[PDB]
Design a protein around this nucleic acid. Structure first.
Ligand SMILES: CN[C@@H]1[C@H](O)[C@H](NC)[C@H]2O[C@@]3(O)C(=O)C[C@@H](C)O[C@H]3O[C@@H]2[C@H]1O
Ligand SMILES: [K+]
Ligand SMILES: [K+]
Ligand SMILES: [K+]
Ligand SMILES: [K+]
Ligand SMILES: [K+]
Ligand SMILES: [K+]
Ligand SMILES: [K+]
Ligand SMILES: [Mg+2]
Ligand SMILES: [Mg+2]
Ligand SMILES: [Mg+2]
Ligand SMILES: [Mg+2]
Ligand SMILES: [Mg+2]
Ligand SMILES: [Mg+2]
Ligand SMILES: [Mg+2]
Ligand SMILES: [Mg+2]
Ligand SMILES: [Mg+2]
Ligand SMILES: [Mg+2]
Lengths: 163, 200, 87, 131, 80, 134
RNA sequence: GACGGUAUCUAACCAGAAAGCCACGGCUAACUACGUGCCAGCAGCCGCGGUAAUACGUAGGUGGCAAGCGUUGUCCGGAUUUAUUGGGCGUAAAGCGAGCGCAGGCGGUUUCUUAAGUCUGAUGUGAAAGCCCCCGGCUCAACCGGGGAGGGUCAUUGGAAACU
RNA sequence: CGCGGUGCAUUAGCUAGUUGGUGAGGUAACGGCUCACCAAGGCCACGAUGCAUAGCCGACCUGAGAGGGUGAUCGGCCACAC
């Protein structure tokens, strides 16, 4: 659990979706907001919120996102290694990229990576492009990233022996 | 083709001062046209990438094809950040070199002097504003053209020069003594966004 | 017969020539047996690069220099070495 | 019928690892012993002991877990298969997760890791990825 | 002195006088999917004395054309 | 599929077809056959000029021309812009492009080419509709 | 010396003769007025127009590109939409109604052996031009020239021997 | 001579100098290249035959690549000239 306090998190509205509940009197239209929050230093989170107005929905989304922060391993400007994040339809491939090549990512993936502090990364969304599931798929991939020191410690090796 | 239109409306489209002085953004710091003063919707990320790219090529007064090809060659540089190496090659453009040395107050003026042939590279006349200047090459004013008010006003007007430039106020001959470092060029320009723009 | 001759290259109004060993019937810019040198006539003193052993070997085999290539071979002194080889 | 005892061995490890079993047993073979040894010295498994029986022997593998029972092995993938044999040249030797994992390669110098194979500058049949 | 091509194969026809048909049976990798596929290339060889019999392994060396379809010469009978 | 299946029956892809087939076929008078020549436009003669109705959502009197092409194919084409000088037996140049309203119309008539006149009074997007700068 | 008084150079003179095209409802960078009222028309897709239309036509602005700009046609991409890399088949397209079986594909453990596959070294060859890499020449670039590299399920030959 | 680069079985049969032999003749040359004889074979689901289309290549366009598309100009080979 990453404590939201002590971090200067920034917010990014990824998608605002207008959703309808059908009622006897007609339709109850609401707004569902998906927000990514991050410190641009290796911590990123996402959250969802629903309200009758866009500003109120975003606030709830932001509060939810802060409670669900995760830390992303990061080698320099890119990620330690290739990873495939899968959640439902979403299927996100993320690869390390050479320094300076930028964030070659599309859709909601860009918000997650930029707010996490990744500056150079290659990715491809291979599944559905529903914003909620691609964001979820992305974090599933980032949660699969491993640090060389942690891998070396788990294997009883020096980082040099591993590499 | 050169852009010969109004200069201010380009800077306020980009939200930066292309002259680096601010006189363009002092009054009406918003986009040109009747819809400028009042509020508009958020720029898309594609618009953010478009404006950043347009900042640079408006900065150095290049058309898009030339800008694209230069950006392609900057990729071929193996070592260093793609965006940084791109910014250096724009600076090494003979146009920019003339303006940096102080022989012109504006880049349009620097281009006008290079195009019309008042400038000499290593003692030899070069009239190509796109000409790429290596480190140590000497950029001077033609012996016939050294006594024109326009350059002499620029020579005395400019009180500051980039640290990567050597200049002699008498010979009117200067040179970049090394490549510019990123911090020495425009920090407000986010070259990462340009790299991603052409990545799309 | 086998000729040691010039193949035109370069661009319009800026000729550059390779010295090649070629069958006489092959097109000027077409099929050739082997490159043996280059000839740059735009230089006020003409620049010639020559694989002298290759040229000397082909001359011994009966290759016939073209008129201009013969001059090129004489300045480089190869035509003297071939003369001394026959002796 | 069983057509790929290696893939069976990798799957037995994967399935036992999934439920965090302490140990695992498999019918023995020379290649299976070779793979078990590489897992042993690369730090992916805790130990390996061999049982002499009447049929073909048995190899017992002791799975390894870290503090909080974190799995040292994330997954194992069979690369070369009976249906499609995979061969790499010395310059084609794969890097698994940028070196945080290993590839087990069969070469004329023996069964070795991807690190060893490109040190000796040799290729061979890629047996499995382990990370 | 330069060498010709010699292939090992199996007699699959000796119903013609002084000639045998041989099969070489190599294996090739599929250009797309990479699997190794069986491939039969069969040759006509001039049998000097009708020695080799059907279902025999024989070595043949290339030669000048001896007939319309003959291009090979029986060299050895390796198995009967 | 298994690898052996793909070896036995390899992958095969759907073949695409043109949106504007009548532009893909030329005609040879001698052999009296149709050649497969991709052409950006084609000349034809207007056999019928009239007006047509759209599909259900829309309602208008869309202007078309029944054009018999130089390759002998009989096509229905649309006359873009406001007002036109076409009549039956006129020579018109056809470009590709459907008209979503008209079910059978797959070609547009090029304005300012051959007998087709430019659009009167046009002042914006003149290169389309074929009107010279005023 | 055909080019040809051609490139080029020098001097004088004048900003004077030398810009458009498309787009601006979303996708998609760029917005307001009139005019029109399911008409006239637009449209790549979704869709616009039914008397207060940023979507039709004009104007003013604006955006993109620029001696070009747009349209059409054709090919690759995006398309993992034939998926070897890299998909699937309970209910979305998809398990033959079920068996028996020829060929074919695949196949348990192990000693020795072979070495066809596999891996590797050397040599030969894979023309020149071209992309790419260095290096020079044209005032720059295009372009040109020089020196390399690459490219084969290539052959010949020496090795290795785990795996098939 | 080995190997390699199109579609269709809603194309499976095809072949009779055809497959091989023995001589003869013929060619720069081997050879059914031709001929007279003696056999009967040859090919083919690893796609024969038929049909349709197409000059081939170095290369060119595209693509992250695997690939896909193309075969103008330049060079090589081939083929043809009412
Ligand atoms: C019988 N009275 C009904 C009943 O109270 C309905 N709720 C069960 C009530 O429901 C409403 O409040 C609604 O939500 C919708 C509207 C159509 O009827 C409204 O008025 C509805 C009332 O008219
Ligand atoms: K529109
Ligand atoms: K597959
Ligand atoms: K069933
Ligand atoms: K072998
Ligand atoms: K005969
Ligand atoms: K042809
Ligand atoms: K003919
Ligand atoms: Mg939830
Ligand atoms: Mg131009
Ligand atoms: Mg001279
Ligand atoms: Mg329009
Ligand atoms: Mg917009
Ligand atoms: Mg409009
Ligand atoms: Mg595909
Ligand atoms: Mg159903
Ligand atoms: Mg079904
Ligand atoms: Mg692709």
């Amino acid at each position: 659990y990453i404590d939201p306090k002590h971090l200067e998190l920034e917010d990014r509205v990824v998608a605002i979706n207008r959703v309808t509940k059908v009622v006897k009197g007609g339709r109850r239209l609401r707004f569902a907001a998906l927000v990514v929050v991050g410190d641009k230093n290796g911590h990123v989170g996402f959250g969802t919120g629903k309200a009758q107005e866009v500003p109120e929905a975003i606030r709830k989304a932001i509060e939810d996102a802060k409670k669900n922060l995760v830390e992303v391993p990061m080698v320099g400007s890119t990620i330690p290694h290739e990873v495939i994040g899968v959640f439902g339809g979403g299927r996100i491939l993320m690869k390390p990229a050479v320094e300076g090549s930028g964030v070659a990512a599309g859709g909601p993936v860009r918000a997650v990576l930029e707010l996490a502090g990744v500056a150079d990364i290659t990715s491809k969304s291979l599944g559905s492009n529903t914003p909620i599931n691609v964001v979820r798929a992305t974090v599933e991939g980032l949660k699969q990233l491993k640090r060389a020191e942690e891998v070396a410690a788990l294997r009883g090796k020096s980082v040099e022996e591993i590499i | 083709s050169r852009y010969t239109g109004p200069s201010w409306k380009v800077s306020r489209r980009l939200g930066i001062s292309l002259s680096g002085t601010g006189k363009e953004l002092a009054r009406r710091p918003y986009k040109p046209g009747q819809h400028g003063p009042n509020s508009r919707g958020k720029v898309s990320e594609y618009g953010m990438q478009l404006t950043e790219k347009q900042k640079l090529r408006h900065m150095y007064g290049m058309n898009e094809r030339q800008f694209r090809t230069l950006f392609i060659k900057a990729s071929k540089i193996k070592e260093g950040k793609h965006g940084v190496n791109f910014m250096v090659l724009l600076e090494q453009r003979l146009d920019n070199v003339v303006y940096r040395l102080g022989l012109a107050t504006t880049r349009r003026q620097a281009r006008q002097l290079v195009n019309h042939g008042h400038i000499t590279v290593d003692g030899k006349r070069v009239d190509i504003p796109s000409y790429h200047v290596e480190v140590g090459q000497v950029i001077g004013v033609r012996e016939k053209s050294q006594n024109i008010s326009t350059i002499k006003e620029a020579v005395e007007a400019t009180v500051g020069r980039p640290a990567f430039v050597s200049f002699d106020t008498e010979k009117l001959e200067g040179s970049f003594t090394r490549l510019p470092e990123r911090d020495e060029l425009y920090p407000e320009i986010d070259e990462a966004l340009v790299v991603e723009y052409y990545n799309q | 017969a086998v000729k040691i001759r010039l193949k035109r290259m370069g661009s319009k109004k800026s000729p550059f020539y390779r010295i090649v060993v070629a069958d006489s019937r092959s097109p000027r810019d077409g099929r050739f047996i082997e490159t043996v040198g280059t000839y740059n006539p735009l230089k006020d003193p003409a620049e010639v690069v020559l694989k002298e052993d290759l040229v000397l070997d082909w001359l011994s085999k009966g290759a016939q220099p073209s008129d201009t290539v013969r001059n090129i071979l004489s300045k480089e002194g190869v035509m003297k070495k071939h003369h001394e080889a026959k002796n | 019928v069983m057509t790929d005892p290696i893939a069976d061995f990798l799957t037995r490890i994967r399935n036992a690892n999934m439920v965090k079993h302490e140990t695992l047993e498999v019918p023995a073979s020379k290649i299976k012993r070779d793979i078990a040894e590489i897992l042993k010295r690369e730090g992916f498994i805790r130990d390996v002991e061999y049982i002499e029986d009447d049929k073909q022997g048995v190899i017992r593998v002791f799975l390894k877990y870290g503090k909080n029972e974190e799995r040292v092995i994330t997954n194992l993938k069979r690369i070369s298969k009976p249906g499609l044999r995979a061969y790499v040249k010395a310059d084609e030797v794969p890097k698994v997760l940028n070196g945080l994992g290993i590839a087990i390669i069969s070469t004329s110098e023996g069964v070795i890791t991807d690190k060893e194979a490109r040190a000796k500058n040799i290729g061979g049949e890629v047996i499995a990825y382990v990370w | 002195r330069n060498q010709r091509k010699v292939y090992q194969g199996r007699v699959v026809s000796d119903k013609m006088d002084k000639t045998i048909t041989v099969v070489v049976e190599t294996k090739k990798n599929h250009p797309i999917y990479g699997k190794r596929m069986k491939y039969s290339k069969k040759y006509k060889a001039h049998d000097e004395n009708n020695t080799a019999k059907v279902g025999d392994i024989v070595k043949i060396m290339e030669t000048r054309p001896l007939s319309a379809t003959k291009r090979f010469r029986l060299l050895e009978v390796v198995e009967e | 599929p298994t690898i052996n299946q793909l070896v036995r029956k390899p992958r095969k892809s759907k073949v695409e077809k043109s949106d504007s087939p009548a532009l893909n076929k030329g005609y040879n008078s001698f052999k009296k056959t149709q050649t497969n020549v991709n052409s950006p436009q084609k000349r034809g003669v207007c056999t019928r000029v009239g007006t047509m109705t759209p599909k259900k959502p829309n309602s208008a009197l869309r202007k078309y021309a029944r054009v018999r092409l130089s390759n002998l194919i009989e096509v229905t084409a649309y006359i873009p812009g406001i007002g036109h000088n076409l009549q039956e037996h006129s020579v018109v140049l056809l470009r590709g492009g459907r008209v979503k309203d008209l079910p059978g119309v797959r070609y547009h008539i090029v304005r300012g080419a051959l007998d087709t006149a430019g659009v009167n009074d046009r002042k914006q997007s003149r290169s389309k509709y074929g009107t010279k700068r005023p």
